[PDB]
Enzyme design. Sequence first.
Site, PDB file in Angstrom:
ATOM      1  N   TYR A  20      -5.498   0.970 -11.605  1.00  0.00           N
ATOM      2  CA  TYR A  20      -5.209   0.414 -10.404  1.00  0.00           C
ATOM      3  C   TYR A  20      -4.244  -0.924 -10.722  1.00  0.00           C
ATOM      4  O   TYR A  20      -3.216  -0.790  -9.992  1.00  0.00           O
ATOM      5  CB  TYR A  20      -6.498  -0.282  -9.886  1.00  0.00           C
ATOM      6  CG  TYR A  20      -6.443  -0.825  -8.372  1.00  0.00           C
ATOM      7  CD1 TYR A  20      -6.381  -0.271  -7.594  1.00  0.00           C
ATOM      8  CD2 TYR A  20      -5.960  -2.204  -8.612  1.00  0.00           C
ATOM      9  CE1 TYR A  20      -6.004  -0.873  -6.073  1.00  0.00           C
ATOM     10  CE2 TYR A  20      -6.054  -2.745  -7.199  1.00  0.00           C
ATOM     11  CZ  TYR A  20      -5.813  -2.127  -6.031  1.00  0.00           C
ATOM     12  OH  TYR A  20      -5.562  -2.733  -4.688  1.00  0.00           O
ATOM     13  N   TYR A  29      -0.339  -1.536  -8.943  1.00  0.00           N
ATOM     14  CA  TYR A  29       0.240  -2.704  -8.228  1.00  0.00           C
ATOM     15  C   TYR A  29       1.409  -3.125  -8.751  1.00  0.00           C
ATOM     16  O   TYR A  29       2.383  -3.489  -8.122  1.00  0.00           O
ATOM     17  CB  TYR A  29      -0.880  -3.372  -8.199  1.00  0.00           C
ATOM     18  CG  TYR A  29      -1.190  -4.111  -6.799  1.00  0.00           C
ATOM     19  CD1 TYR A  29      -1.972  -3.479  -5.832  1.00  0.00           C
ATOM     20  CD2 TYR A  29      -0.486  -5.511  -6.308  1.00  0.00           C
ATOM     21  CE1 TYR A  29      -2.338  -3.973  -4.617  1.00  0.00           C
ATOM     22  CE2 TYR A  29      -0.882  -5.862  -5.199  1.00  0.00           C
ATOM     23  CZ  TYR A  29      -1.610  -5.224  -4.173  1.00  0.00           C
ATOM     24  OH  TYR A  29      -1.855  -5.555  -3.029  1.00  0.00           O
ATOM     25  N   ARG A  70       0.820  -1.333  -0.118  1.00  0.00           N
ATOM     26  CA  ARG A  70       0.138  -0.033   0.003  1.00  0.00           C
ATOM     27  C   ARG A  70       1.047   1.161   0.148  1.00  0.00           C
ATOM     28  O   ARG A  70       0.709   2.258  -0.646  1.00  0.00           O
ATOM     29  CB  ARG A  70      -0.886   0.082   1.044  1.00  0.00           C
ATOM     30  CG  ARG A  70      -1.857  -0.889   1.169  1.00  0.00           C
ATOM     31  CD  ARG A  70      -3.045  -0.776   2.189  1.00  0.00           C
ATOM     32  NE  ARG A  70      -4.112  -1.851   2.313  1.00  0.00           N
ATOM     33  CZ  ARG A  70      -4.081  -3.098   2.882  1.00  0.00           C
ATOM     34  NH1 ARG A  70      -2.927  -3.034   3.867  1.00  0.00           N
ATOM     35  NH2 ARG A  70      -5.005  -3.861   3.096  1.00  0.00           N
TER      36      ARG A  70
END
EC number: 4.2.1.84
Lengths: 197, 212
Positions: free
Chosen positions: B72, B76, B56
């Site tokens: 997104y 990651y 995170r």
Amino acid sequence: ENAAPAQAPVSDRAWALFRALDGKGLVPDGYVEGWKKTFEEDFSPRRGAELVARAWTDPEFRQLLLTDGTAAVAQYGYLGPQGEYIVAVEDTPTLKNVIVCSLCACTAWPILGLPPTWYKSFEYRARVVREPRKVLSEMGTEIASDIEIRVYDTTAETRYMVLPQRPAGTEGWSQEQLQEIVTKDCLIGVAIPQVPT
Amino acid sequence: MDGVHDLAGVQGFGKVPHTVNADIGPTFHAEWEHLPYSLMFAGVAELGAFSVDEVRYVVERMEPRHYMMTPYYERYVIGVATLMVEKGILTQDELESLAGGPFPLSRPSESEGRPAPVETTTFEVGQRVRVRDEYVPGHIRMPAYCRGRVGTISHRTTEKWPFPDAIGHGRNDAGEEPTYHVKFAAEELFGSDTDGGSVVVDLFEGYLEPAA
Ligand SMILES: [Fe+3]
């Protein structure tokens, strides 16, 4: 100039990461393939729907689900990654619950499925905390003025599911029939279960 | 970290790209999209190289304009790759060689993090609490909209977890704390400029203090 950094195609970067790790013996045989299968086939909002339908027809289970969500979910064997500590939140005639992860995408994966693109959108992450009524309205869900909206921001390890109200016209339906009308969006809290005309 | 990722309450965004029960397509919309999560699990569970909190935080560390124009799953991929380079498992050179082009990573951390607070309070359901008026440059799981605000305890967790502000930096002093579901009135967070009722934030014990 606020310009984007030059970047290789994302597919090329993602596979480069895989190959770099795999080439060093760091990824077990069949590892990512196994996770893909789990993500696509096991983690599913059908599981959350099953839980809701059970809660709707079994007052004892409903009470367990609302007081110890983890225990209730464990009875079905549906605990898992990003779904180890579960809290179910109860909609009432005066309360509508909605779930978000404003800081990223946190979601109860095993029982809701992986989050969809829209839930991860900056639009949803920015807006639903501050104007949930307008957001739901735009999405097609009208929440009346005399229902309080409560937004749960998934900021730590609790993973949430909404237990929506059971709609009129479903009296006596089987668990299978009830499961059918509980959708992913019902579990996230942006939709209300719909009964066919 | 007061980064652009802390989006709650930001104004000017348009419509959410979804109407209820619309087709969302398959779980993965491209053949690479299962890789970020599966490789994060390799890193966390198989290699023990980093925690989920570190993932995170590394995504929070993306250059802001880069964060804002990246979907997104790609964030990651960038995050996990960055962690692999930072932990000395991979090099950026080999990533760019294999990728056949540029593979920019998240920015270095500007904070060493902080330990789990020594002095905290066990709160009870119904108690009023205030979110500590603190600024943390590293990882924190307190969205800025609740900083310094007052709410009530709806739940204390029966489990405890490492303090994100520590484990998100790979520190040895994250200890363990329960979290609390703290209910804020919408007007406490956004004054007259909200159409909502209440917001419940899941806050670590170390982010809270008695109200008054
Ligand atoms: Fe998240």
